[PDB]
Structure 1
Amino acid sequence: SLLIRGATVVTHEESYRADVLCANGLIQAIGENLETPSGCDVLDGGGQYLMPGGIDPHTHMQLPFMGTVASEDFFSGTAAGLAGGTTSIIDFVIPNPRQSLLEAFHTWRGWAQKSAADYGFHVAITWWSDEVAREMGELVAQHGVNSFKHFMAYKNAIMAADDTLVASFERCLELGAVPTVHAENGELVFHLQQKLLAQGLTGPEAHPLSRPPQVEGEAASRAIRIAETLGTPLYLVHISSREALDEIAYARAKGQPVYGEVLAGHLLLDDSVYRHPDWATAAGYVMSPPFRPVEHQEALWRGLQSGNLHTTATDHCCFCAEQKAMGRDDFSKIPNGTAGIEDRMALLWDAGVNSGRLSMHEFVALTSTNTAKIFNLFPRKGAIRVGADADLVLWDPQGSRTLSAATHHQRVDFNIFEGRTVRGIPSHTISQGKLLWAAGDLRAEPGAGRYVERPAYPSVYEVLGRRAERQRPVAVER
């Protein structure tokens, strides 16, 4: 067992000085001057903050994608997360078109077995048929999935057009599952890619131009209004644009349950990174949605402060130089993705909390609690309370770290924040009650993490249910 002693507990709401005891994977007791079981290990947290471990709901460990397989696997990725204070992930099962969802799910379960920390899956709806809708039913009832991902881009691949989105959202409603969406207009992306290639703009600087912010705002508006019509909630993954954020805020003002996810990269980087003279450097930043002109970073910070963006994630999707260089002659063939699972919490703490833009409680809400609530994992996760999973991070407000591809634990040769020094770092990370990161030493073990099931019908479905009752149509009698 493990007792964290002398730290200030910081939750999504409040701060209070307390000791915390963990045993048997759970938080057992919280209070001052706690009694110590015999042989219990002790961690001294004086002058530090003790928070829930981060939850990263958007990772792509060893994703086979755009020709090849991501260089980060489920072990090295979850391990790198632990070093950065992240104690659990939600990844994506991505069936090929025409491929059984259950078959892809079991393949992905095997891959994730080596995870060093708790993990779960969204399942992507990459094609539609009657059997897909049935396989969605087994995934929810039997395999602990409660959210389904829809890609609005990738025309001629996995793009879900309006009819699939409509049919799939209706299925999500019947199952009490959360629809999630990668919001970019796939038709516009395809058109711009071919226009830019025909002009000879083959380099990475054409990648931001091939999917400008209104392509994201359009798809956000469309998924949001399909979700309103069908009566489902909606989770929009990694929002990057003022356009998309303004569509989310518009829907939330109308009482619609719409959630926005954001990456640290889109809070802190602008699209000038794509104009770097060195091809490999520019290609290192290639991901979808791309990094944006500076106006959009300020807008995203406003969404965080106003409560119109709710969760942080990383889109952790690692490709090394040789893999990126598959698109050396054609930016549209660069495998999309950047690393970030190890860096998310420190980047957000340094930019948000140190500056006073965000409270420590907002930081906790944005790194674990809101994700936990949205996907029906609260208070098992994202919570410091008796009976909750003992996933915790000890945070040193005066500690320093310099992000570098040469020193990070992410199995990739590039860092989009290379050279950045942050103040405020995770000194210790606790997962399932065990100390797996301690001041420079990572103790992750392959296979230690558990598969985390997420129950259906998060509490928003209670609100939606009564709304549908109140709005039943009544015929006119004539």
Structure 2
Amino acid sequence: SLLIRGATVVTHEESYRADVLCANGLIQAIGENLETPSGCDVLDGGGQYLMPGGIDPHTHMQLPFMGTVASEDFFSGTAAGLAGGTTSIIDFVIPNPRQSLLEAFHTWRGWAQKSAADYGFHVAITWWSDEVAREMGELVAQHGVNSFKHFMAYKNAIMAADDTLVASFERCLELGAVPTVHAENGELVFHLQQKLLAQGLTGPEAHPLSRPPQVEGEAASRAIRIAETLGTPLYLVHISSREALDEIAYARAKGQPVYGEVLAGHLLLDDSVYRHPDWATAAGYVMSPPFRPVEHQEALWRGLQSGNLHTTATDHCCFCAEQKAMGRDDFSKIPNGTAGIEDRMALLWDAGVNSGRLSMHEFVALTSTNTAKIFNLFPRKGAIRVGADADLVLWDPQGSRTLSAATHHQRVDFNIFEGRTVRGIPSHTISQGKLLWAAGDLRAEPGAGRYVERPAYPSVYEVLGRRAERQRPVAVER
């Protein structure tokens, strides 16, 4: 067992001094001056904040691309998360077109066995048939999946057009599953890529021009209004633009359950990174959606503060210099992705809490509790309460860290915040009740993490079901 003594417990709504006892993977006792069971390790939390461990609902460990694969695998990635205070992830099973969803799922489960910390899967709907629909039923009922991902970009690859979006959202409703969407208009992205390439604009500086913010705003509007029409909730991954944020606020202002996820990169970086004179440096920032002009950063902070953005994630998707250079003559061939799992909570604490933009309670809500609630993992995760999973982070408000590809634990040779010094760091990270990160020493072990099942029918479907009862149409008697 493990007892954290002397800390201030900080949740998504309150702070209070208390000790916390963990055993058998769970929180067993909370209170002042708890007794110590015999042979129990004791961590001295004086002067620090004890918080739920971060949940990163957006990762892509060892995701295949071309004949190559993300340079971070499920062990190195989950270990790097632990070093940064993140104690569990939700990754993505991405079937090839016409490939069995269950086949892809078992493959990814094999890849994920080596994880060092708890993990789960979204499953992407990259094509449609009666069989896909039946397979999502089996994934929900027998494999712990409760959320399905849709890509509106990637024409002539995994794009979900309207008819797939409609059939699949309808299926999610039947199953009590949460539809999630990468919102970018695939036709416009494809058209702009071709236009820019024909102009000889082949460098990384053309990447953001190929998918400007209104391309994301349009896709968000469309996914949102499909969800409204079919009567499902909707989770929009990595919101980067004022345009898309505004569509979310509009829908939430109509009563509709729409959630938005944001990455630290899109809160803190602007699109000038793509004009760096060194090709490799500019290519290190290539991801979709791309980093944006500054006015969007301000708008996103506003969403977080006003409750129209709800979770943070990383889109952790690592490619080293030689992989990025596959697009040296064609930016559309640059493997898209940036690293962030190790860095998310310190970036957010330092930019959000130290500034006074966010309270520490909002910080917890935005790094674990909201994600737990949305995907039906609360209070098993994101909660400091007796019986909850013992996933915790001890936080030193006066510690500092300089982010650097030379020192980080992420298996990648680039950091989009290279040289940034933050104040406020995870001094200790506890997963399943075990101390896996301590004072610069990572103790992660391959195979330690568990596959985490998520039950269907989160609370929102009760509300939605009563709405549909009252909107049931009624014929006119004539």
| Same fold at TM > 0.5 | yes
Identify if the C-alpha distance between structure 1 residues 67 and 184 changes in structure 2 by more than 3 Å, giving closer, same or farther. farther
Q: CA deviation at 1:82?
A: 0.1
CA contact (8 A) 1:122 1:148 kept: yes
Task: List aligned pairs for 1:352-391, cutoff 5 A.
Answer: 352-391=352-391
- In the alignment, the residues of structure 2 paired with residue 268 and residue 219 of structure 1 have an alpha-carbon distance, to the nearest angstrom, of 23
> How far apart are residue 51 of structure 1 and its match?
0.1
Residue of structure 2 equivalent to 1:255: 255
Distance in 2 of aligned mates of 1:291 and 1:349: 20
Residue by residue, what CA displacement relative to the aligned partner does 1:85-111 show, whole Å, maximum 9, x if unpaired?
A: 000000000000000000000000000
Task: For residue 468 of structure 1, give the secondary structure of its aligned residue in structure 2.
Answer: helix
Report if aligned partners of 1:119, 1:451 keep a CA contact under 8 Å in 2: yes
Distance in 1 separating the partners of 2:171 and 2:66:
29
Task: Confirm whether residue 464 of structure 1 aligns to residue 461 of structure 2.
Answer: no
Distance, in Å, in 1 between the alignment partners of 2:71 and 2:153 is 23
How far apart in 2 are the matches of 1:326 and 1:124? 25
- Secondary structure at 1:296's aligned position in 2? helix
CA contact (8 A) 1:67 1:335 kept: no
Residues 373-421 of structure 1 deviation map (CA, whole Å, 9 limit, x = unaligned): 0000000000000000000000000000000000000000000000000
User: SS of 2:72's equivalent?
Assistant: coil
User: Which digits, 9 at most, give the CA deviation of each residue in 1:5-63, with x for residues without a partner?
Assistant: 00000000000000000000000000000010000000000000000000000000000
Secondary structure of residue in 1 paired with 2:280 = helix
Aligned to 1:74: 74
**CA–CA distance in structure 2, aligned partners of residues 343 and 20 of structure 1:** 26
Give the whole-Å Cα distance in 2 for the aligned partners of 1:417 and 1:79. Answer: 19
Shift of 1:68: 1.8
- Divergent runs of 4+, >6 A: none
Cα offsets for 1:413-463 (capped at 9, x unmatched): 000000000000000000000000001000000000000000000000000
Find the aligned partners of 2:26 and 2:148 in 1 and give their Cα distance.
29
- How far 1:4 moved relative to its partner? 0.2
Deviation at 1:66, TM superposition (A): 4.6
Structure 1: 5+ residue runs without aligned partners?
none
Q: Percent of counterpart pairs with the same letter?
A: 100
Pairwise CA distance, 1:312: 0.1
- Alpha-carbon contact 1:12-1:364 (below 8 Å) kept: yes
- CA drift of 1:269 comes to 0.1
Contact 1:55 / 1:89 at 8 angstroms: preserved in 2? yes
Distance 1:424 1:310 in 2: 22
Q: In 2, Cα distance between the equivalents of 1:14 and 1:204?
A: 45
1: CA distance between counterparts of 2:316 and 2:439? 23
Residue in structure 1 matched with residue 135 of structure 2 by the alignment: 135
CA distance in 2 between counterparts of 1:439 and 1:88 reads 20
RMSD: 0.4
After superposition, give the CA deviation of every residue in 1:332-379 in whole Å (9 maximum; x if it has no partner).
000000000000000000000000000000000000000000000000
1:222 aligns with 2:222: yes
Report the TM-score, using the length of structure 1 for normalisation. 1.00
Structure 2, gaps ≥5 residues long: none
Is this contact kept in 2: 1:66–1:334, CA < 8 A? no
1:462 & 1:35 partners in 2: Cα distance? Answer: 42
Q: Is the contact between residue 305 and residue 358 of structure 1 (CA under 8 Å) also seen in structure 2?
A: yes
Counterparts of 2:29 and 2:255, CA distance in 1: 38
Deviations 1:90-149 (A, max 9, x none): 000000000000000000000000000000000000000000000000000000000000
Q: Distance in 2 between matches of 1:244 and 1:367?
A: 21
Distance in 2, matches of 1:234 and 1:66, equals 30
Corresponding position of 1:264: 264
2-structure distance, mates of 1:56, 1:123: 16
Distance apart, 1:3 and its partner CA: 0.2
Please report how far the alpha carbon of residue 477 of structure 1 lies from its aligned counterpart in structure 2 after TM superposition: 0.4
Match of 2:34 in 1: 34
1:191 deviation in Å?
0.1
Q: How far is the alpha carbon of 1:67 from its aligned partner?
A: 4.7
Number of residue pairs matched by the alignment: 478
